[model samples]
Target: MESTVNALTSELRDLRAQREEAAAAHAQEVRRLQEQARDLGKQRDSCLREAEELRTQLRLLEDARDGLRRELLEAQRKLRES
Candidate 1:
């Protein structure tokens, strides 16, 4: 009976140690996932800014092209009148 009780106590102790290790590992993995998510968010913000900058440039080019077209039409009208 003494041996049986001693063995059971030892088993309980072993299980407690394993549970502690598992909890520590779970905490570490949670932090790692959080860091990865933060990095991904920064990458997405950078991509969004780049696209917005390109759109502004496109708008500027379109305005310039329209101005040129108007000037060309005025010149053609003057040539016809003369």
Candidate 2:
């Protein structure tokens, strides 16, 4: 009876240790995930800024193209008249 009690006590201690280790590991994982989420948010903001800049550049290029086309047509008309 005494040996059976000792065996049971040992098993209980082992179970408690395993539970503590698992909880510690889970907490560490949670912290890592939170950091990752913050980094992704920063990346998203950077991408948004880059997209806005590209849009501005595209608009400028389109306007320039239209101006060049109009100038070319006027020059051609003048040449034909000459």
Candidate 3:
């Protein structure tokens, strides 16, 4: 009977160790996923900033084009008057 009790106790200890190891592995995976998510968020924010800058540049170019067209039209009118 004593030998049987000893054998059961050994089995329980082994199972407990395995459970602890599995829990540690799961925690490591969770941490890795969290880091990846943070990196992705940073990348997304950088892309958004770049897009906004491009939009501003586009607006400036459009305004310059309109101004040039107006100047050309005025110059042609003055030449016709002369």
Candidate 4:
């Protein structure tokens, strides 16, 4: 009947509006996730740089310790001579 048709049309309109709203919300969430991923990448790069710097410093300290060991052995020999 005419009343049934009118009710069906109204229901279709409401469903369409709900779908549009859901699509808009989905797009907004995608953008936010993209931005979050970008920030995490930058943070990862920063941590990598800091780790490399620390490794370089550790290498330098190890070299210095080896040189001191050699110097100490030499001084010990000179003491035994004395």
lDDT for 80 (candidate 3): 100
Candidate 3 lDDT over residue span 25-72, tens digit each: 999999999999999999999999999999999999999999999999
lDDT of 1 by residue, 1-82 (tens): 9999999999999999999999999999999999999999999999999999999999999999999999999999999999
Candidate 2 residue-wise lDDT, 1-82, digit = tens? 9999999999999999999999999999999999999999999999999999999999999999999999999999999999
Q: Please, what is the TM-score per model?
A: 0.76, 0.62, 0.78, 0.70
Q: How many backbone clashes does candidate 1 have?
A: 0
- Error at 27, model 2, angstroms: 1.7
Q: Clashing residue pairs, candidate 2? A: none
Candidate 1 runs further than 4 Å off = 75-82
User: Which is the winner by TM-score between candidate 3 and candidate 4?
Assistant: 3
As for TM-score, the candidate ahead, 1 or 4, is 1
Residue 5 error for model 4, in Å?
0.8
lDDT of model 2 at position 49: 97
lDDT of 1 at 9: 100
* lDDT agreement of model 2 with the native: 0.99
Q: Report, for every candidate in turn, its global Cα lDDT versus the true structure.
A: 0.99, 0.99, 0.99, 0.99
